[PDB]
Amino acid sequence: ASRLYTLVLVLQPQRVLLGMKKRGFGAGRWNGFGGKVQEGETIEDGARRELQEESGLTVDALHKVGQIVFEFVGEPELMDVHVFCTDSIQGTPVESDEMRPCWFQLDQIPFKDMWPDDSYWFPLLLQKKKFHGYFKFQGQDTILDYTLREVDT
Numbered sequence: 001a002s003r004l005y006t007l008v009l010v011l012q013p014q015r016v017l018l019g020m021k022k023r024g025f026g027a028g029r030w031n032g033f034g035g036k037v038q039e040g041e042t043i044e045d046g047a048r049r050e051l052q053e054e055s056g057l058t059v060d061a062l063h064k065v066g067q068i069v070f071e072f073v074g075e076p077e078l079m080d081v082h083v084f085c086t087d088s089i090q091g092t093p094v095e096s097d098e099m100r101p102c103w104f105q106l107d108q109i110p111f112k113d114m115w116p117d118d119s120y121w122f123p124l125l126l127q128k129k130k131f132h133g134y135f136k137f138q139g140q141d142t143i144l145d146y147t148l149r150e151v152d153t
């Protein structure tokens with residue numbers, strides 16, 4: 001059993017857009033835009049919806065770059081996160097209060113205040129790779145094990 005999620009990274013050559021989650025699961029961490037995919041909606045439609053809802057941005061196209069499965073030890077349900085990137089945004093970020101948006105220079109990505117897994121997979125988005133990942137967590141802060149299967153693009 002798994003629950004499906006999306007994550008969208010607005011990635012330009014000089015910078016990336018991240019959001020800080022203000023409350024709920026992952027509050028206090030910079031991340032892409034995303035959330036749970038709903039019954040009856042395709043993964044890409046859910047990615048677009050979450051991007052709109054959280055940042056007020058629409059996009060012409062999304063591109064799939066990766067999938068990551070997360071296991072929390074002791075919990076039966078896996079998280080299955082589909083990761084997309086875009087540089088085709090319409091509008092300018094609108095600050096919700098699920099997320100606080102902020103652009104970051106690519107050599108100033110705030111890894112210490114991101115989910116720990118991002119330190120492993122996020123550089124793959126800069127390194128011309130698509131990937132499938134699996135991370136075993138013990139609580140929220142501790143990676144016990146991970147795997148990454150990567151292909152150069």
Ligand SMILES: Nc1nc(NC2CC2)cc(-c2cccc(Cl)c2Cl)n1
Pocket residue numbers: 005006007025026031032034035036070081115117118137140
């Ligand atoms: N970068 C990153 N890393 C994550 N690490 C998993 C241990 C939590 C989870 C998420 C994420 C993605 C989409 C929706 C939601 Cl709720 C989340 Cl939490 N993002």
